[model samples]
Target: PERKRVSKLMAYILRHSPEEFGLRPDVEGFVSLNELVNALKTVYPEVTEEFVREIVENDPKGRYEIRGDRIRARYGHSFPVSLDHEEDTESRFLYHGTPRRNLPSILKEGLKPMKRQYVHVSTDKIEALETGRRHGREVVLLVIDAECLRKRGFKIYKAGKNVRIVERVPPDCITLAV
Candidate 1:
């Protein structure tokens, strides 16, 4: 319970609302670990830098990255942050999962970031399905033609282990996953 609480708090602060906590992340979405731990301590009195480090190191999704004295979320940011990950040219296809209700608009306009900074996708279909399941009961999967997108000059990036990100996916480059 304690670990989950800390993890969620960190995600909220790092990915969504750092300014609310008086943290000003750099253009790359990184803030010093000392500042982050001090901010975290406001919520959890006993929060220490070492404890935060442990939570980051053991994160299952590989969501958090620690670079020397700094920490940042790997993906899923609501505010603008130039992660600038290297282009992923090798992935031929990527999978995105969403609620069935989103299909019509997605089919019409393709995938957009909506509230997040970038559209998140998975290299694995099952992973996409699971991600979609969190939004609604009836889920739909879309397969992205990454090769075609790259040919047309859309940049695709590998984020962390399983997550991939792109600015947008045009409808022509998307197909319903069977």
Candidate 2:
């Protein structure tokens, strides 16, 4: 229970509401790990630097990255962050998982970043389905033509091990995968 709570709080502060916790990340979205621990200590007094490091190291999706004395969320930031990720040029298809109820509007308008800085997609279909399952039980998977999007000047970046981030995916490049 404690571990999960700390993890969620870390995600909240690092990914969405840093200002709410009195943290100001750098342009690359990195904060001093000590400062982050101090901010988290406000709510979780028992939280320690070691405990937070454990949480970051154990994240299955590689969601958090700790470099030297600083840490940052690798993706899923709502605030503007200038992450220098390499452009993905070799992928042919990328997948997005969403709730079934969102299908109509998504089919028409295509995939967007919504509250996030980038539209999250997966290089693996199973990962996409897993992401969709979090939003709803009935999930719909959409395949994006990465090649086509690239030809049209859309940038696709490999954010994490299996996660790809794009600015937007037009409807013409999207097709139902499931």
Candidate 3:
């Protein structure tokens, strides 16, 4: 039982990404999960995938997959297709396919009580616009203004940490899933 629980703990530890904990600096996203886990094992004696899974699944914010590959926890509170905006150099949220349930209310609920300085919502990625329109999936993109980002005291370098917003996300790459 202890081993099982420990396995789960180690698994979750591996699942963690710097971005998830808010200390990511080299924002090319993060190193592969395998590398992260291996690095942790040096400090943690009883770490394994099962243990990692145990700790990660318990995370309040749901985590993504960890099928023996590089680990990448969700980047920010504003998950999904979120990126920095070129139009205003702010964080933007994007919605892909139409949601199965009503979204506006929930969207509002998610935004409420946060003292939003800037929020921009778009319907599609520039490259995926044709595909989305053809498939009848409503595309939504959200952007937070650059001024707000600056006020928050974060930097935007092409390859540095905060880059999820600075770097242009291309659809061809598995940008979102990665």
lDDT of every predicted structure (CA atoms): 0.83, 0.84, 0.38
> In candidate 3, what are the lDDT values of residues 1-178, reduced to their tens digit?
3444444433344334344432332232333655555655665656766666565566555544444553444444332223232233443433232232423543444322122122222333552344335545554333333334344554333321232333322222111310
Off by over 4 Å in 3: 1-30, 63-68, 75-178
Q: Candidate 1, which segments miss by more than 4 Å at Cα?
A: 1-12, 15-84
Model 1, 17-108: lDDT tens digits are 99898887765688989999999989898888989989998999999999999999998988656576556778888998888887888999
Off by over 4 Å in 2: 1-12, 15-84
- By TM-score rank, best first, the candidates go 2, 1, 3
Candidate 1 or 3, higher lDDT? 1
TM-scores, each model vs. reference: 0.59, 0.59, 0.29
In TM-score terms, candidate 3 sits at: 0.29
lDDT of 2: 0.84
Model 1 residue 56 CA deviation (Å) reads 18
